[PDB]
Amino acid sequence: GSASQTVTIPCHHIRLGDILILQGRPCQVIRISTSAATGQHRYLGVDLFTKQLHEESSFVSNPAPSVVVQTMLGPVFKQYRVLDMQDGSIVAMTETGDVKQNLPVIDQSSLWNRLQKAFESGRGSVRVLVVSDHGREMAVDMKVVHG
Amino acid sequence: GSASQTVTIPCHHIRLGDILILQGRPCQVIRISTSAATGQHRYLGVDLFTKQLHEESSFVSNPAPSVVVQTMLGPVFKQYRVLDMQDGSIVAMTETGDVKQNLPVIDQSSLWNRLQKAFESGRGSVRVLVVSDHGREMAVDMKVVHG
């Protein structure tokens, strides 16, 4: 794994708790403040893998006249099926049938417990949302597909 | 004025109060719910110009494998300078020097009052954020530029 795919988010749609790419790292935002000198917004986040703190200021662009936008980068989440769960890791499958045997689950907002209860009442409708960071994947949220 | 420029917003970055394009109309979101049959998110908003209610469901796309994204459209805000204020309308100027003599200000969260107090303590640093809808422009927020 080299880099990863990113989406561009306008700063007015970013709130505490969102997941941003802060200096190449997937992070959960815990502070938002504003530079008095430049007006850029400044984002303090926790690294999802290493749990270290990082900060990054926003990018200001002038695409059209009278159009000023500030943006940050967000990660593209992948969506895997859950084939099972064994001691803090899961067996997942991608949309093309590629099996991942020991995919880890982050410890955040008791995701393991919500995932387990959803798995035991509807295996086929549960999905994990997965973040990639330089070859390493981790499940960071869950989702139940209706059909 | 024909259409307008739009940005694409991921549904996980949309919260109550955001401004979305709901069925071609600039709207303030007041409900978010989820379709049980499809899993699309459903957005109920108030028309910023006519104050009528509109609803629209999200667009589900499958760009890459294991990548599912839901999006809505947001308006691109323009940024005008304030040359003055006279009875509920302002004289604004665009970044290229085009003057707009009777630009209206929306009545929302007492924007006129915050704008007036900022104008009388720093005319040159105040900006209005402007929404366009089929030729009609309106100021919907304010901003103070540091430099």
From Swiss-Prot, chains A, B:
Changing residue 123 to A: Does not affect self-assembly. It is found in: Cell septum. Disruption phenotype: Impairs plugging of septal pores and leads to the loss of cytoplasm in hyphae severed by lightly drawing a scalpel blade. One of its GO terms (molecular function) is translation elongation factor activity. One of its GO terms (biological process) is positive regulation of translational elongation. GO terms for cellular component: cell septum; Woronin body. Forms oligomers. Self-assembles into hexagonal rods. Belongs to the eIF-5A family. Hex1 subfamily. Major component of Woronin bodies, fungal-specific organelles that occlude septal pores in order to separate intact from damaged compartments. Hex-1 binds directly or indirectly to the Woronin body tether that in turn is anchored at the rim of the septal pore. This is Woronin body major protein. The gene is hex-1. The chain holds residues 27 to 173 of 176 of the full protein.
